[PDB]
């Protein structure tokens, strides 16, 4: 997961229920039909360095998001992956100067 997005529109989706065999490559390889995967976020414990079974994914055009959302399901590696419309969120703010 990276921190840097200008596009006002949030083409990010929430992918959960992901199997213990599915990964970045797969996700995209399966989320490339709906449109174009620009970024692939994944939540996991560094120590482990592996996606438990959930995360998020960014597309090129908001459209993609909708396409996936509607389906709210996908067959990746013989598994049903849940997908929902994700929303933008960050913990950064502007500052006047060094304090």
Swiss-Prot record:
Interacts with DAZ and DAZL. Mainly expressed in testis. Expressed to a lower level in thymus. Weakly or not expressed in heart, liver, brain, placenta, lung, skeletal muscle, kidney and pancreas. This is DAZ-associated protein 1. Acetylation at Lys-48 is predominantly observed in the nuclear fraction, and may regulate nucleocytoplasmic transport. Residues 11-88 form the RRM domain. The chain holds residues 110 to 195 of 407 of the full protein. The modification N6-acetyllysine is found at residue 48. Transmembrane segments: none annotated. RNA-binding protein, which may be required during spermatogenesis. Residues 83-92 have a biased composition (Basic and acidic residues). It comes from the Eukaryota. It is found in: Cytoplasm; Nucleus.
């Amino acid at each position: 997961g990276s921190s840097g997005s200008s596009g006002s529109k949030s083409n990010k989706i929430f992918v959960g229920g992901i199997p213990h065999n599915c990964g970045e490559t797969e996700l995209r390889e399966y989320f490339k039909k709906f449109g174009v995967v620009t970024e692939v976020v994944m939540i996991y414990d560094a120590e482990k360095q592996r996606p438990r079974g959930f995360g998020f994914i960014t597309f090129e055009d908001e459209q993609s998001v909708d396409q996936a959302v509607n389906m709210h399901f996908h067959d990746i590696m013989g598994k049903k992956v849940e997908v929902k419309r994700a929303e933008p969120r960050d913990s950064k703010s502007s500052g006047p100067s060094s304090g």
